[PDB]
From a paper:
We demonstrate that in Type I [name] systems, defense and methylation require [name] site DNA binding by the [name] ([name]) methyltransferase employing S-adenosyl methionine as a cofactor. We show that [name] contains MTD and TRD homologous to those of Type IIL R-M enzymes, and, in addition, contains NTD, CTD, and insertion loop in the MTD specific to [name] proteins. We show that [name] alone does not methylate DNA, and [name] activity requires an assembly of a supramolecular BrxBCXZ immune complex.
We have determined the apo, Ocr- and DNA-bound structures of [name] [name]. 2D class averages showed that the sample contained two distinct particle sets, enabling us to solve both the apo and Ocr-bound structures from a single dataset. The map resolution for the second [name] monomer stretched from ~3.4 Å around the core of the particle to ~4–6 Å at the periphery; hence, we rigid-body fitted the first monomer model into the density of the second monomer (see “Methods”). Around ~10% of [name] particles did not bind Ocr in our sample, enabling us to determine the structure of apo [name] by rigid-body fitting [name]:DNA model in a 3.9 Å BrxXapo map. The TRD and MTDs of [name] are connected by a flexible linker, and the apo-protein exists in an open conformation.
Numbering used by the authors: 1 to 1205
The structure:
């Protein structure tokens, strides 16, 4: 495996070389501070010796360092360090690869010795290698060999000579002479501490058998640094630092073989080439008109030396390798001389641009090695490549021109250009040359932009001629002319390369969103690409067509976001008006092996250049598989689709590419009215979420508009919610008094104000499972996340009809197809289809009635009437069975109604549709599946359901005891602040059947000392509701139900002990969970020990509550505890032995509780000193922290640890 050897060594070594570079800088008086300011020491010249502080060197090296000084100021310090580091790394890797494969003339290892670790073959053949490299001074080297010492110097000299020899064959990688990096070459190569030994014996040689390993370097040597430049804003320097990957071979072969091979086969269908190309795609059938039109432009014959392949982003160059393979196959088929084939291919068949010098060097080396593998006589001819990297333009305008002395050699020295000197074309004009100035002016910020700079085609041919002249000046001119030509070559070369027109383009554009783009890049994108400015690859794809000529091709692999999203929507339209698809493979996630994360969802597509809307493309579906399975399925031609016309994509609104979609569905989409613009967007508040939004049960009924009359301070407001059908989620209240004067002060957004308080349908803007719409009566306000629907004053579309249509399977499927991201903005909803009928109205009415009846059986709804179990007088089990039967009947009725609606819609449309996830889910609390989620098996939710029912019964009984509920009348009894009016209700006899506590304080202890014990009142309530004869069996049943799932059953106890334990242990958690951390019953606990705990109703509370509670409870409890302690102490002397022991220990705990109680009393004393009065409108979360530690779980509610007095 590659990662076993190449990885775990490539990244670390990247830093190591850099360190050596720093060392060299320290030896040359070159340094930078923390801020990066230049700290270059001043050279001292004494005795032809240069000194930089302490270090010294011979005078001959002085001028070279001066160039480095320029390198210090022309660019960044770290830039130069990294440049030298990767240059040396690439050179060493290339030398190792060449020596291992034995392509050298002499055929001797340099970095190691065969069958002898830590040695050198050249040391055994010094005269031969010296003659091969340096015949002129070999004898002196032999003297060094005669010396036996200075082995390091001899090795360094041999390495430098080998590099100089290798310069000629690869001018783009090795320098001939006067290389500054020679001074930067690390010393002590012969010593074991040198990194050369690690490079030699850190990777097995068996990995050096294929070119593939080279590519891995391009993905590893920077990978570590990628981790430091990922997820942040990216500058120009770091543009390649986080957008370098590797591509699997099969994808590249699919891209290449279906672009050039198809063009070749169209001209010559009878050729023995399709057999070799395994990934070629057989075109589908076409109409005779399409065939006639296509055959009208197919060329009769194409010269082999006329095909152009261009790569805007080469990197490793494996795409170029595949192209070279295909072109070699074509040339061999034609019948040229075999060994002549490679060089010709490298002449006018490959072109590559990149933005990193390292990538260009790697690509050149890879191509040269691939060519060498087959041709033996390569490297003996000066073959010049065309894989280059862009260069910035900062040079003297005319000084280089003056040094050119063009008129002296041929012509055009002073004023002669391609045009006249004073032509003044565009803005560059011609101080010395027209074309030169025009070309140079367009590369001012080339490093910032890249391959996106456009060049006019008309200037192509002339440029070519100009290039030739420079080629005649590098060898047949004076020193000044040669250096000027060398300086000016790259700019003209890259301009001419960009100025051509090509046939096939293959590339893998880098991925970078809006965040990565800097200000300059973003403003350039906005200026140049209005329709694709969202992301880089969109601009890349749009611009790639600018270089293709007629009958071109574009093959690319990129993210699938442009397929559906509306941001690229216009782009999609522009594709469907002038282009013509050929093929597309949707890979989705789980592709790009050796890469963590499934966010990468990519597709590979091949698109023609001309326009023909009646062609039939070929698609594929390879989403749900692993890499090997995807490759096998593509090999086996799995999941094909050839039943779609290109023009049909323009009928679906939004123009989304949906290949797997049927045809009848698309046709039926058109002949149906749309929803129109009835949908509106809800209002929004700036930052007042916690200022006006509250839960309904925590405010006064008078302050509630829905419950109260006359004055209005609060209003319900729907907002979000989970999946829910036809009714629910009315659990948020907002403050809108005096037409939102406070909101207008807050400057909150207000939209469609005049249409408020109107009945209609509402849907959730941001969902996670699907789409659903719910009814809403009048007197409501809708949030921005609660965009609503309102029918016109006089139109045939009723709200019930729309609600019936929306929740059908057809609408859900269409919505899923349109927006696969589960996001529902107003605009997309505005273009939904809608049907018209009459039975749908009554069916929707019945569904709404059933849903509302289901929702009106819980305390969380203000429309609560009464508990279900108290309507049956037979028995507890009988009432439970009746309740279960009622829920089952509701479920069955809803299921039948949904089935009938679906059947009616399907028969109206006339074609069946598929079923998907959550297509038949029932959103009722009666359904155990929806209420309790999904488990491994059914039948588990019986004991839990019974326990929850009994818990609800106990909670209702507690609420009745508190006075909130009364059995005399239905609905809410008293929910007003300050307990005011309680005496009037007592006089009215609202609690006639069941007395209500006068002080609104519920003690909770383990003894029956208090006459108002919760347990005793519960027993009285049960005996009143269900009589006295069957009291014991009912209590046993309730205890069993509680022991089922609520708490672990105890070994031996009666019903009363179980009830008391459940109340003292589990009740608070259940209440908090039910009311979602906004409790209405406040618990005051003396401590963790059950010394004293009481419950208080929030509404009935007032200032006098605290002192009255303290006086009426703590002092009598203190007296009782003191008397019990005195009695126990008196009896302790009477008792003896173990009988006394159990009497003593508990006593301690008791007095411990007593002590704790005293402490609580002290705390109470503090709050007995001050009088506290609060308001509901302040906020329960706000007010809960006003009592210090008198409450429990204060951090859970208030969100922070409470203070202490």
């Amino acid at each position: 495996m590659n990662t076993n050897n190449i990885k775990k060594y490539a990244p670390q070594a990247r830093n190591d070389f850099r360190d050596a570079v720093i060392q060299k800088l320290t030896t040359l008086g070159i340094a930078a501070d923390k801020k990066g300011n230049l700290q270059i020491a001043e050279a001292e010249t004494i005795g032809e010796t240069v000194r930089y502080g302490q270090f010294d060197y011979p005078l001959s090296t002085l001028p070279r360092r001066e160039r480095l000084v320029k390198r210090a100021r022309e660019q960044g310090f770290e830039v130069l360090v990294e440049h030298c580091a990767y240059t040396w790394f690439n050179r060493l890797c290339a030398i190792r690869y060449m020596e291992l494969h034995g392509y050298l003339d002499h055929g001797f290892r340099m970095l190691s010795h065969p069958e002898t670790p830590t040695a050198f073959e050249v040391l055994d053949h010094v005269p031969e290698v010296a003659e091969a490299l340096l015949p002129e001074s070999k004898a002196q080297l032999v003297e060094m060999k005669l010396s036996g010492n200075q082995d390091e110097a001899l090795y360094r000299e041999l390495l430098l000579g080998q590099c100089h020899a290798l310069h000629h064959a690869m001018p783009f990688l090795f320098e001939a002479v006067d290389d500054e990096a020679e001074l930067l070459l690390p010393d002590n190569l012969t010593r074991t501490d040198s990194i050369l030994r690690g490079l030699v014996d850190d990777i097995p040689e068996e990995d050096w058998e294929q070119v593939e390993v080279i590519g891995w370097l391009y993905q590893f040597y920077i990978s570590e640094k990628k981790d430091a430049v990922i997820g942040k804003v990216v500058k120009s320097e770091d543009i390649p630092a986080a957008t370098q990957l590797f591509t699997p071979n099969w994808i590249v072969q699919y891209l290449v073989q279906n672009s050039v091979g198809r063009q070749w086969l169209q001209t010559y269908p009878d050729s023995p080439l399709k057999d070799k190309m395994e990934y070629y795609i057989e075109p589908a059938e076409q109409t005779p008109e399409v065939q006639a039109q296509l055959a009208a432009i197919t060329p009769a014959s194409i010269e082999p030396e006329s095909i152009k392949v261009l790569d805007p982003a080469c990197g490793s160059g494996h795409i170029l390798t595949e192209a070279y393979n295909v072109l070699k196959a074509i040339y061999e088929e034609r019948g040229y001389r075999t060994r002549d084939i490679p060089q010709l291919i490298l002449e006018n068949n490959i072109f590559g641009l990149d933005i990193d010098d390292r990538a260009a060097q790697l690509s050149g080396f890879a191509m040269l090695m691939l060519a060498r593998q087959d041709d033996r006589r390569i490297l003996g001819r000066g073959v010049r490549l065309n894989i280059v990297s862009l260069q910035e333009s900062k040079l003297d305008i005319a000084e280089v021109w003056t040094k050119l002395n063009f008129h002296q050699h041929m012509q055009r020295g002073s004023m002669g250009d391609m045009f006249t000197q004073g032509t003044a074309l565009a803005n560059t004009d011609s101080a010395e040359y027209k074309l030169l100035m025009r070309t140079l002016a367009l590369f001012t910020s080339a490093k910032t932009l890249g391959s996106l700079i456009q060049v006019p085609q008309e200037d192509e041919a002339a440029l070519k001629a100009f290039l030739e002249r420079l080629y005649r000046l590098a060898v047949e001119g004076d020193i000044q002319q040669k250096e000027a030509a060398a300086e000016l070559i790259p700019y003209i070369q890259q301009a001419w390369i960009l100025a051509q027109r090509y046939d096939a383009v293959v590339a893998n554009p880098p991925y970078m969103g809006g965040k990565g783009m800097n200000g300059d890049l973003k403003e350039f994108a906005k200026k140049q690409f209005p329709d694709s400015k969202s992301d880089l690859f969109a601009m890349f794809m749009q611009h790639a067509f600018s270089l293709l000529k007629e009958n071109g091709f574009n093959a690319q692999v990129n993210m699938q976001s442009w397929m559906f999203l509306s941001s690229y929507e216009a782009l999609r339209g522009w594709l469907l008006d002038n282009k013509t698809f050929i093929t597309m493979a949707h890979l989705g996630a789980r592709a790009f092996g050796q890469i963590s994360g499934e966010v990468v969802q990519t597709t590979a597509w091949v698109i023609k250049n001309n326009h023909s809307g009646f062609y039939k493309p070929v698609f594929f579906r390879l989403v749900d598989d692993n890499e090997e399975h995807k490759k096998n399925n593509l090999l086996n031609r799995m999941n094909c689709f050839k039943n779609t016309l290109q023009n049909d994509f323009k009928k679906i609104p939004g123009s989304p590419i949906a290949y797997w979609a049927t045809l009848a569905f698309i046709n039926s989409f058109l002949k149906l009215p749309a929803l129109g613009t009835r949908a509106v967007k809800g209002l929004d508040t700036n930052g007042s979420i916690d200022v006006f939004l509250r839960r309904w049960p925590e405010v006064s009924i008078n302050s509630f508009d829905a419950l109260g009359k006359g004055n209005s301070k609060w209003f319900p407001i729907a907002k979000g919610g989970e999946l829910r059908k036809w009714f629910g989620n009315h659990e948020y209240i907002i403050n809108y008094e005096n037409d939102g004067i406070e909101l207008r002060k807050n400057k909150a957004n207000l939209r469609n104000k005049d249409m408020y308080f109107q009945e209609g349908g509402t849907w959730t803007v941001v969902s996670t499972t699907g789409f659903s719409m719910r009814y809403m009566p009048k007197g409501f306000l809708f949030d921005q996340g609660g965009s609503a629907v309102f029918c016109e004053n006089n139109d045939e579309l009723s709200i019930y009809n729309i609600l019936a249509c929306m929740n059908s399977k057809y609408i859900n499927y269409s919505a899923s197809l349109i927006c696969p991201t589960l996001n529902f903005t107003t605009g997309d909803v505005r273009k939904f289809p809608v049907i018209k009928n009459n039975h749908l109205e009554d069916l929707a009415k019945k569904a709404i009635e059933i849903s509302k009846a289901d929702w009106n059986q819980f305390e969380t709804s203000w429309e609560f009437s009464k508990n279900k179990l108290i309507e049956h007088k037979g028995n507890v089990a009988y009432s439970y069975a009746s309740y279960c039967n009622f829920q089952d009947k509701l479920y069955e009725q809803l299921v039948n109604i949904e089935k009938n609606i679906n059947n009616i819609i399907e028969e109206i449309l006339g074609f069946k549709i598929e079923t998907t996830e959550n297509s038949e889910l029932i959103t009722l609390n009666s359904n155990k599946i929806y209420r309790y989620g999904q488990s491994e098996t059914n039948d588990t939710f019986l004991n839990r359901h019974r326990s929850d029912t009994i818990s609800e019964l106990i909670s209702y009984s507690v609420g009745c005891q508190m006075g909130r509920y009364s059995l005399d009348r239905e609905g809410l009894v008293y929910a007003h602040e300050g307990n005011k009016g309680f005496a009037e209700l007592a006089a009215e006899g609202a609690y006639k059947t069941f007395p209500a506590d006068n002080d609104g304080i519920l003690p909770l202890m383990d003894d029956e000392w208090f006459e108002d014990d919760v347990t005793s009142r519960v027993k009285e309530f049960v005996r009143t509701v269900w009589g006295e004869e069957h009291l014991q069996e009912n209590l046993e049943f309730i205890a069993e139900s509680l022991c089922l799932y609520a708490i672990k059953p105890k070994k031996g106890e009666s019903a009363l002990e179980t009830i008391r334990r459940y109340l003292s242990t589990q009740f608070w958690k259940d209440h908090m969970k039910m009311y979602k951390k906004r409790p209405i019953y406040w618990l005051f606990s003396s401590g963790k020990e059950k010394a004293f705990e009481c419950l208080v109703y929030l509404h009935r509370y007032n200032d006098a509550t605290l002192s009255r509670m303290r006086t009426e409870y703590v002092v009598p409890l203190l007296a009782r505890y003191q008397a019990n302690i005195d009695r126990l102490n008196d009896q302790l002397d009477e008792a003896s032995g173990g009988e006394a022991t159990r009497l003593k220990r508990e006593r301690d705990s008791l007095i411990k509780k007593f002590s704790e109680l005293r402490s609580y009393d002290d705390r109470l004393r503090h709050y007995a000193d001050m009088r506290i009065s609060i308001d509901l409108d302040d906020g329960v979360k706000v007010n809960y922290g006003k009592f210090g530690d008198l409450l429990a779980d204060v951090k859970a509610i208030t969100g922070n640890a409470p203070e202490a007095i």
